[PDB]
């Protein structure tokens, strides 16, 4: 994978380009069904070991049923949406009268059916575990025929295996208030996730991307609990729909660019605030300042547009022209000179100021480079570890080419007597207006 990185000395920043995007623009709601059987009484009275075990399993099942019945830097601009809005909407629609009957009647002969609800929504419903099946015709006949005295322990073991999923699901629903994320393996296995992705009415490229990264897709999805009545437990899985695939995406890292004036209290420091990922979608590229919202997996950047911002394409130029008149880059300013480093994808940016000792070393030769004063950049091929002061970082060993694009750091363009050091989200033009 021909991944590339650029380091600019003008802002002591680094852009990593050459990724494949996966931008969650929609939500796909699928009604997962577990057909249960509401056992009204477990009237066994035998004190035998097998009877003790089978009554224990029936008691956990009944308590599970009763529990499921009881259940019924730029981040401040992100709009607080309801990640479980679609699932809770479908659940409320299912809470109407006559919806459970349609869900049950549509799945009498098949495993997957599109049901038209009263809201007007057509939902894909799929039975992933028919506990009702195993209980009514495979379990209750044996237990009732032998009068609660199981003859062989294998049936108890297979009852454990089948009821373990229901018990685990009940556990997460109890300790998580009916909303769990990411979707555990108990709610949706990997085979079932692949199958559900394949059966979506979307293009083939989105299918292949999600089929290659089912794990990240599961990490980005939600599970919402819905009705349990009339021998059926339905819950809505809310899967990410990446309406845009294979777009250019680049990550921006920034380090504190501070001056190295001789006087302690008279230096000034600058830092670009728009760090994070930029994934290109249509007219204006998506931006994610919260790195937790993006996941990098084998050069594939999976991110969520709900926790993102929509900006023009000119944000890419924020890396090329810092004084451009068509985009105003955002920065923060301060005067606290602390030396620190950021580990990029293809190297490490080290800002070494004051008397802090900074070195770059590989394990088989010791210290190979001594970082002088300023913001510098070290590659990833020749060095394994970096050390600033007495704190130790390790350089990412990703395979790829890094370009040390030379430049004059912009900090020398400001007068320390005029530098405003009280900004958390600033802009180049408004900082210039502050200077003015």
């Amino acid at each position, epitope marked *: 994978q021909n991944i590339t990185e650029e380091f600019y000395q003008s802002t002591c920043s680094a852009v990593s380009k050459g990724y494949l995007s996966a931008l969650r623009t929609g939500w796909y709601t699928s009604v997962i069904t577990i057909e249960l059987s509401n056992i*009204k*009484e477990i009237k*066994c009275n035998g004190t035998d070991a097998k009877v003790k075990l089978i009554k224990q399993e029936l008691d956990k099942y009944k308590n599970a049923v009763t529990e499921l019945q009881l259940l019924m830097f730029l981040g401040f601009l992100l709009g607080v949406g309801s990640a479980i809005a679609s699932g809770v909407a479908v659940s409320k629609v299912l809470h109407l009268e006559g919806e459970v009957n349609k869900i049950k009647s549509a799945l009498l002969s098949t495993n997957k059916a599109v049901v038209s609800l009263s809201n007007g929504v057509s939902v894909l419903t799929s039975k992933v575990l028919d506990l009702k099946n195993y209980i009514d015709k495979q379990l209750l006949p044996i*237990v*009732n025929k032998q*009068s609660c005295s199981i003859p062989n322990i294998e049936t108890v073991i297979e009852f454990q295996q089948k009821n373990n999923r229901l018990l685990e699901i009940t556990r997460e629903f109890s300790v998580n208030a009916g909303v769990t994320t990411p979707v555990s393996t108990y709610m949706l296995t990997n085979s079932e996730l692949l199958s559900l992705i394949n059966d979506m009415p979307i293009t083939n490229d989105q299918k292949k991307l999600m089929s290659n990264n089912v794990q990240i897709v599961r990490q980005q999805s939600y599970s919402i609990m819905s009705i349990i009545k009339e021998e059926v437990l339905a819950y809505v899985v809310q899967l990410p729909l990446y309406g845009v695939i294979d777009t250019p995406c680049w990550k921006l890292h920034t380090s504190p660019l501070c001056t190295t004036n001789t006087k302690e209290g008279s230096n000034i420091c600058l830092t670009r605030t728009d760090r994070g990922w930029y994934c290109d979608n249509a007219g204006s590229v998506s931006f994610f300042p919260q790195a937790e919202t993006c996941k990098v997996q084998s050069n594939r950047v999976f991110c969520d547009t709900m926790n993102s911002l929509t900006l023009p394409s000119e944000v890419n130029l924020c890396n090329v022209d810092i004084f451009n008149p068509k985009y105003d880059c955002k920065i923060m300013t301060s005067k606290t000179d602390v030396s620190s480093s950021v580990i990029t994808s293809l190297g490490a940016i080290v800002s070494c100021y004051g008397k802090t000792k900074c070195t770059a070393s590989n394990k088989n030769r010791g210290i190979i480079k001594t970082f002088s004063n300023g913001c510098d950049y070290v590659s990833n091929k020749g060095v394994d570890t970096v050390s600033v002061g007495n704190t130790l970082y390790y350089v990412n060993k990703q395979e790829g080419k890094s370009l040390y694009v030379k430049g004059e750091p912009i900090i020398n363009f400001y007068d320390p007597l005029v530098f405003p050091s009280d900004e958390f989200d600033a802009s180049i033009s408004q900082v210039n207006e502050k200077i003015n």
Partner: antibody
Amino acid sequence: EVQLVQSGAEVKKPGESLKISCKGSADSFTNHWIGWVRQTPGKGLEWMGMIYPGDSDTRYSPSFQGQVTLSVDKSVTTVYLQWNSLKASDTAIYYCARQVGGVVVAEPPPYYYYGMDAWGQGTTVTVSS
Amino acid sequence: DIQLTQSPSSLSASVGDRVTLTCRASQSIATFLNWFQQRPGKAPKLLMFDASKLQTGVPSRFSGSGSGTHFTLTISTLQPEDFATYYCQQSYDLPLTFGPGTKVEIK
């Protein structure tokens, strides 16, 4: 193997009450329901009711609901059948029978009764002048 | 509630013959049917449950088949002690009801 002993022959005048008993064993009697049926000469067997010895729960037939009552005592492993008011048409042979299954059911029907395997020797009850 | 009718209402056979005896329920009872045998003056004895599966202690010469609203019982080698009255018994819903009865007589 398991046996159930019943009360002897019973003769009465119309109007009064009557109680009959059926006694079984200790081990298995705990996990089996006890049902009662009636059989008249020349007709088929008519199911009267059923009770569980453990919880003394009652389930009656539509034709015998309110006409006769059932009771149980686990302490002496006894089941009793008690009539509020006898009639002339009640002269028949009555059977106590243990039925396995039905210990766990869900949304009945269907029920999970499978057998009535051990029956009492039959009590002949006559209502005559 | 449910009407169970046994066919034929009466039957004649010889010793050792293979006899098939059916009964039909007015409603689907889903293989939850039992077969009892009773002699004059004797309590009924359960032979078969689930309409095909043999109770422990009942001779293996008895067999059963059927489902829904049609069931049948098959005896391979008839014995004079086998000749008695046979009742099929529904266990699907309350109240549990019997059929009219079949008298197997050696003629």
